[PDB]
Design an enzyme around this catalytic site. Structure first.
Site, short mmCIF file in Angstrom:
data_model
loop_
_atom_site.label_atom_id
_atom_site.label_comp_id
_atom_site.label_asym_id
_atom_site.label_seq_id
_atom_site.Cartn_x
_atom_site.Cartn_y
_atom_site.Cartn_z
N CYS A 36 34.42 25.83 30.81
CA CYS A 36 35.45 24.99 30.22
C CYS A 36 34.84 23.67 29.76
CB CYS A 36 36.60 24.74 31.19
SG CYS A 36 37.84 23.60 30.52
N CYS A 39 36.25 20.38 31.17
CA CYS A 39 35.88 20.21 32.58
C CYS A 39 34.55 19.50 32.72
CB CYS A 39 35.81 21.56 33.29
SG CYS A 39 37.35 22.44 33.45
#
Length: 111
Positions: A36, A39
């Site tokens: 991600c 993230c």
């Protein structure tokens, strides 16, 4: 890094939530994944805040790949998701990689 505690199991998750309840300190959790993009963008700030607020707030990391059952129980759908736990139960959340909103979330619950 920093003062973030990496959660490696359901047993460890339960134990940390119980410790936050016993210590009367809030817990902020980063639910994250290494695939991600956002993230990885916000992880350095999460770690910086874990140092700044060490002693006032407990910081945990849950990689949804490492502990899928804890992510499922938490109702995660998007990442990163931050949860605040007080006295064993979810008190607040924040989804997405906004740096100002994460700083504000920690300041709010450290007060």
């Amino acid at each position: 890094g920093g003062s973030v505690i990496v959660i490696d199991s359901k047993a460890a998750w339960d134990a940390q939530l119980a410790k936050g309840k016993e210590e009367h300190k809030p817990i902020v959790v980063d639910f994250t994944a290494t695939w991600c993009g956002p993230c990885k963008m916000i992880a350095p700030l999460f770690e910086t805040l874990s140092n700044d607020y060490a002693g006032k707030v407990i910081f945990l990391k849950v990689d949804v790949d490492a502990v899928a059952a804890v992510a499922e129980a938490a109702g995660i759908t998007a990442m990163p998701t931050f949860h605040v736990y007080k006295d064993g139960v979810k008190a607040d959340d924040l989804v997405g990689a906004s740096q100002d909103k994460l700083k504000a979330l920690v300041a709010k619950h450290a007060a």
